[PDB]
A paper describes a structure:
ATP13A2, which is mutated in juvenile-onset Parkinson’s disease and autosomal recessive spastic paraplegia 78, is a transporter with a critical role in balancing the polyamine concentration between the lysosome and the cytosol. The overall structure of hATP13A2 has a canonical P-type ATPase architecture, with the cytosolic A domain linking to TM1 and TM2 domains, and the N and P domains sitting on the TM4 and TM5.
Capturing the hATP13A2 structure in the E1-like state at 5.6 Å enabled us to assign the backbone of the amino acid sequence to the EM map. The structural comparison showed that hATP13A2 in the E1-like state presents a conformation similar to the E1-ATP structure, with the cytosolic domains next to each other. During the transition from the E1-like to E1-ATP state, the A domain, P-domain, and N-domain of hATP13A2 are tightly tethered together by ATP to form a catalytic center for ATP hydrolysis and aspartic acid phosphorylation. Four intermediate states (including E1-ATP, E1P-ADP, E2P, and E2-Pi) were solved at relatively high resolutions (3.2–3.7 Å), whereas the E1-like and putative E2 states were solved at medium resolutions (5.6 Å and 4.8 Å, respectively) probably due to the rapid dynamic equilibrium between the E1 and E2 states.
Residue numbers in the entry: 36 to 108, 161 to 496, 498 to 587, 609 to 697, 709 to 791, 815 to 1169
The structure:
């Protein structure tokens, strides 16, 4: 994706700069297919010398944007585009990327010796980067009102208002204007909510202390802060303005609310005198913006200080919020499938309108008044209540998230309508965060004998000191806190650390034990190292702990027991986790991981949540494949699978040995060809090579893949990208820090143990359970059908309104003004709002929701309903001949004053019943929501509607003048009315109960259809070929 930067600097004398004022309004045209003359809009072709107007040809892009002057105050031009910053380059033409050729590399000599910049005209530094603040642009209320009024639907509504005012019917104009006003207010509220909810994330500026060269200390606002400037921690407590790199010493930082898991991770200063450092090593020795600081070691005299390196929208914090405003990537699904339906509706409306206008023109009716009546008839195509009512269902559904989970920020909620896959993480979702001590086995005194494994503090020796000082706990005037596994290890020995006054243990029988250096437990290396020294020791002793798989390789080959595989896999069958320890007396950074020697093994317990099995079993009944991603040891998921019954009938995996270039990887039977009928398990090391090697096997192997072992976090993004390329919609659950990498844009997922008002991802709930997945699934699926229901209701209402208006026009009689309102005010908006109040159904959907509209069955059902409605109930023209009445005074005035007309009264009375019965029947449905009576507001609304409607058919009382109703000659004439209305009532249910049946599919059970969709062909080939 690239494009040129051509433009015309001024090319304006004009003198024609004013002739275009009266020209046609062209902005709307340029938004779609700008080839119609976008260049004519003050965009002549010219060179790239000082271009005031910068535009991109979008040769390989489907969108374009324009940015303009001015630059502040050699002088280098700059502009702001989507939050990115660029600066002019003198040596070359055009602009260049920000950070002045740094790209993470710079002269470390002067940079390390940060003596403080001596005010070298800081204005230049400010121009390139700008103020060190983040402020998402916010538009004023009039700005948001005016810029949202260009929608063509609103223009059509305004034209309808103007026409209704012109035709001497201002009452309808008032109702249309009120509808437009409510639409405007609800749109303004929707636009506000997101902005005013995401605005709180913008941390306010605060006073900070910054040091100057020569020993001068001054307090300045955080705005003045610039990258590469001095920055001193505030009294070892507070908040950080932006990211920075520690100059020296050790510091403690947390990223609970910004990255995920709240467990503190130790931080150490970056190596000195090495060279340029890229972003890969930043995480090891980089800070984060808006993070609390616990304590820092004051190894050197002067207090701890840091230097900022990143600022503005290019910071790590800014990247996550960059997705806000401009969507990236664009919406997965585009609703371009209703073209056939809208074309059919338009052609039907045109046919009806031409028939009606011809009928009206007949009978020697004046031609002058035909045009206005035809316009009124055709205005029924798009009532003003459509946009307002269609856009409120999502907002009403969003109210559920406030009460019940998940706690999300809005439009992307519909991406889960047609999901067919789900993923889970075993790190903390399927097991409790805390670990239970089970036992430990030493490897001293006996060369290789197993001895007796049990957790006891009685034995003493190097193992005691290794376990005592192997952790990353943090303390603040209370008991130590940190990773649950570390505190579980340390509590076994019972030793405590309290106030060197911070690197010395307590209650040491043999000799006090101290520590020299401490490192975190980053999952990248899945291991940690520590140096342990005690007084009187000949030399310091180093200790390293980590996964048993890799410790053996780096250790002395002739130290491990011959049957170490049996020892390590004995506890695997029980579902427990095992770790290995090592030590070596290294005499006086990567050098400390040399020929180490293992010292022992430790086994922990990972209890499974009792509530995982039933929810998973219930979710397994929807015929959706489930996969797991984790970097644990070989197998160890058999117990979990048995608990949730995924591989209960059969299970198999793939060999791990793939070192040889031949990569001969035959299948394994766990507990011959490879039909892959059973469930296959992959491995991290194998997945890292099989993806690029033998690509033809990837499509037919990824489908059967269920679990992964010893896989690095870097493969998650690749895995999700591959699944997306395979046209697979899947979700995953995150519970740690190395889980949000794949949540950026590929594709969706869930999180666990997250704080409120999360902005990193549109998740999650507050409960620390995987029970939210059924909740989000069911709420989403019940939300999908709301759009279909409202579309059906709107279409049927439009069809009946059109048929009524065109049939009524058989003669000069015309309906008044308040008659239209009596329906448009309490039959359209009320029910539209009420239907949005539905809720999810307790029973999980057995089948996936309908694919999409339009479809043959729904068209057949709706056309059948329309023909039935337009059928027998039109007997008001024929059956009336059997009762006394007088013919209307046709032609008498051709005005709506014909109050005593008989046909108008009956049609108006039955129109409300038709509308309400259609609304009730269209919303009927057993799955995806509870029955209609579950909603109390809807019951009261329909009850009062029926109570007030039935009063009109009953002998009218006093105060009936404004309604223009007329008395009935015979009180018994209502027998036909009640009979026909009850017949329609029963028929609606009778037809709805049979049309929902599979008859549309029953008539084509001998289907020759063969739909692949890139999902069925693979499995068909797999089952056909062994």
């Amino acid at each position: 994706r690239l494009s040129g930067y051509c433009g015309s600097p001024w090319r304006v004398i004009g003198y024609h700069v004013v002739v275009w004022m009266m020209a046609g309004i062209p902005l709307l045209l340029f938004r779609w297919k700008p080839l119609w003359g976008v260049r004519l809009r003050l965009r002549p072709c010219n060179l790239a010398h000082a271009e005031t107007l910068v535009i991109e040809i979008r040769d390989k892009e489907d969108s374009s944007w324009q940015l303009f002057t001015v630059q502040v105050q050699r002088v280098l031009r700059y502009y702001l585009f989507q939050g990115q910053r660029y600066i002019w380059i003198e040596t070359q033409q055009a602009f260049y990327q920000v950070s002045l050729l740094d790209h993470g590399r710079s002269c470390d000599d002067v940079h390390r010796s940060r003596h403080g910049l001596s005010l070298q005209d800081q204005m230049v530094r400010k121009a390139i980067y700008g103020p060190n603040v983040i402020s998402i642009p916010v538009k004023s209320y009039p700005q948001l009102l005016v810029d949202e009024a260009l929608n063509p639907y609103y223009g059509f509504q305004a034209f309808s208002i103007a026409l209704w005012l012109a035709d001497h019917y201002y009452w309808y104009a008032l109702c249309i204007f009120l509808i437009s006003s409510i639409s405007i207010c609800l749109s303004l509220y929707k636009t506000r909510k997101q902005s005013q909810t995401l605005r709180d994330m913008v941390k306010l500026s605060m006073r900070v202390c910054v040091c100057r060269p020569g020993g001068e200390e001054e307090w300045v606002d955080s705005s003045e802060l610039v990258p590469g400037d001095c920055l001193v921690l505030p009294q070892e407590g507070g908040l950080m303005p932006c990211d920075a790199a520690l100059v020296a010493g050790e510091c403690m930082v947390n990223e609970s609310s910004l990255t995920g898991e709240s467990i503190p991770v130790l931080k150490t200063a970056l190596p000195e005198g090495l060279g340029p450092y890229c972003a890969e090593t930043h995480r090891r020795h980089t800070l984060f913006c808006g993070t609390l600081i616990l304590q820092a070691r004051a190894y050197v005299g002067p207090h701890v200080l840091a230097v900022v390196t990143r600022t503005g929208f290019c910071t790590a914090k800014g990247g996550l919020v960059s997705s806000i405003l401009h969507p990236r990537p664009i919406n997965f699904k585009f609703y371009k499938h209703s073209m056939k339906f809208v074309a059919a509706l338009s052609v039907l409306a045109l046919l009806g309108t031409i028939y009606s206008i011809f009928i009206l023109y007949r009978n020697r009716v004046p031609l002058n008044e035909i045009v206005i009546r035809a316009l009124d008839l055709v205005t029924v195509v798009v009532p003003p209540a459509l946009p307002a009512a269609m856009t409120v269902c999502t907002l009403y559904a969003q109210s559920r998230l406030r009460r019940q989970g998940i706690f999300c920020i809005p439009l992307r909620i519909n991406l889960g309508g047609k999901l067919q896959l789900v993923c889970f993480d075993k790190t903390g979702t399927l097991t409790e965060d805390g670990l239970d001590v089970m036992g430990v086995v030493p490897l001293k005194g006996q060369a290789f004998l197993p001895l007796v494994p049990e957790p006891r503090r009685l034995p003493v020796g190097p193992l005691l000191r290794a376990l005592a000082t192997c952790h990353a706990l943090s303390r603040l005037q209370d008991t130590p806190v940190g990773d649950p596994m570390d505190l579980k290890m340390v509590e076994s020995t019972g030793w405590v650390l309290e106030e060197e006054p911070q690197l010395q243990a307590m209650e040491e029988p043999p000799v006090p034990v101290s520590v020299l250096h401490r490192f975190p437990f980053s999952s990248a290396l899945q291991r940690m190292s520590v140096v342990v020294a005690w007084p009187g020791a000949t030399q310091p002793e180093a200790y390293v702990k980590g996964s048993p798989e890799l410790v053996a390789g780096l250790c002395n080959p002739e130290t491990v027991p011959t049957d170490f595989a049996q020892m390590l896999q004995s506890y695997t069958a029980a579902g427990y986790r095992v770790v290995a320890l090592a030590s070596k007396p290294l005499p006086t950074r990567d050098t400390v991981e040399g020929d180490l020697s293992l010292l022992g093994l430790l086994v922990m317990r990972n209890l499974l949540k009792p509530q995982t099995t039933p929810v998973i079993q219930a979710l397994r009944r929807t015929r959706i494949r489930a996969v797991m991603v984790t970097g644990d040891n070989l197998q160890t998921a058999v117990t979990v699978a048995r608990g949730c019954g995924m591989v209960a009938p059969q299970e198999h995996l793939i060999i791990v040995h793939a070192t040889h270039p031949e990569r001969g990887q035959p299948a394994s039977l766990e507990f011959e060809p490879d039909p892959r009928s059973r469930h296959l398990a992959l491995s991290g090391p194998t997945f890292g090579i099989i993806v690029k090697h033998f690509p033809k096997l990837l499509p037919k192997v990824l489908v059967q893949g269920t679990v992964f072992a010893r896989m690095a976090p870097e493969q998650k993004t690749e895995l999700v990208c591959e699944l997306q390329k395979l046209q697979y919609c899947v979700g995953m659950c995150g519970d740690g820090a190395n889980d949000c990498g794949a949540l950026k844009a590929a594709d969706v997922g869930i999180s666990l143990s997250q704080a409120e008002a999360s902005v990193v991802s549109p998740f999650t709930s507050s409960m620390a359970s995987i029970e939210c997945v059924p909740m989000v699934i069911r709420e989403g699926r019940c939300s999908l059908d709301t759009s279909f229901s409202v579309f059906k209701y709107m279409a049927l209402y439009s069809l009946t309104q059109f048929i009524s208006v065109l049939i009524l026009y058989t003669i000069n009689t015309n309906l008044g003004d308040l008659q239209f309102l009596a329906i448009d005010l309490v039959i359209t908006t009320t029910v539209a709002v009420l239907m949005s109040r539905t809720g999810p159904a307790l029973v999980l959907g057995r089948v996936r929701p309908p694919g999409a509209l339009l479809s043959v069955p729904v068209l057949s059902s709706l056309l059948l309903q329309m023909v039935l409605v337009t059928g027998v109930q039109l007997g008001g023209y024929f059956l009336t001949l059997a009762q006394p009445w007088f013919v209307p005074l046709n032609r008498t005035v051709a005005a709506p004053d014909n109050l005593p007309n008989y046909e108008n009264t009956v049609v108006f009375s039955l129109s409300s019943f038709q509308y309400l019965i259609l609304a009730a029947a269209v919303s009927k449905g057993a799955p995806f929501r509870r029955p209609l009576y579950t909603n109390v507001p809807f019951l009261v609304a329909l009850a009062l509607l029926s109570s007030v409607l039935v009063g009109l058919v009953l002998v009218p009382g006093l105060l009936q003048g404004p309604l223009a109703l007329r008395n009935i000659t015979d009180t018994g004439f209502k027998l036909l009315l009640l009979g026909l209305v009850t017949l329609n009532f029963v028929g609606a249910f009778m037809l709805e109960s049979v049309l929902d049946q599979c008859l549309p599919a029953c008539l084509r059970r001998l289907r020759p259809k063969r739909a692949s969709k890139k999902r069925f062909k693979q499995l068909e080939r797999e089952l056909a070929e062994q």
